[PDB]
């Protein structure tokens, strides 16, 4: 999605979005503390884009 | 089943008739013989019909 960043920044980004944001929101939506639930489907799709462009670079 | 090595001979199928023309299915086998013929790689023993063994072979 026009991320156009250094591939190591792509790996830092997949590793940040991959657990931290998404895993935290998955715990919050279970223990009854997350509203703005639509964050989740945002982060998921972000973790797809960072992966696809890295695969395009190969 | 079996069949001649050199040529392709193999049993065929037909009828067997009585004196009243009562048909019944039967076979016609080939005259295969176990003969040790001489091909390079090794001399091997294979089925060959007695029709091919006449006039030309290695044994």
């Amino acid at each position: 999605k026009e991320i156009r960043n250094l591939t190591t920044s792509e790996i830092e980004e997949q590793i940040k979005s991959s657990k931290e944001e998404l895993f935290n929101l998955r715990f919050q939506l279970a223990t009854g503390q997350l509203e703005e639930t639509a964050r989740i489907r945002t982060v998921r799709k972000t973790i797809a884009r960072l992966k696809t462009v890295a695969r395009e670079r190969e | 089943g079996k069949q001649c090595f050199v040529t392709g001979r193999k049993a065929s199928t037909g009828n067997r008739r009585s004196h009243a023309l009562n048909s019944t299915k039967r076979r016609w086998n080939a005259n295969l013989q176990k003969v040790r013929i001489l091909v390079d790689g090794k001399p091997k023993k294979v089925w060959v019909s007695a029709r091919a063994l006449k006039s030309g072979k290695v044994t």
Binding site: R26, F27, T31 | -
Partner: protein, 87 residues
């Protein structure tokens, strides 16, 4: 890794033992070794032990059309130092 899915906050068999034991729904193809190392890598604790049990898919959820739920795997971890593994 994220081999842990959910905390399991139930009435007695998760809150009557939350003095030291913390229960999760985990992935269905993992060990207690994988979960014992995943908890220690996520929360930074020392996990004394871990017990796991499988649950079959119940056919309870039936609306106009009858169907089954998901098979699920539940893991209880006993800590040796630390806390706060489900809020």
């Amino acid at each position: 890794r994220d081999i842990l899915k959910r905390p399991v906050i139930t009435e007695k068999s998760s809150e009557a033992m939350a003095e030291d034991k913390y229960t999760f729904d985990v992935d269905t193809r993992v060990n207690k070794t994988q979960v014992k190392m995943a908890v220690e890598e996520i929360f930074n604790v020392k996990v004394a032990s871990v017990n796991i049990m499988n649950y079959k898919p119940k056919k309870k959820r039936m609306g106009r059309y009858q169907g089954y739920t998901n098979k699920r795997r539940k893991a209880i971890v006993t800590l040796k130092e630390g806390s706060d593994d489900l809020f």
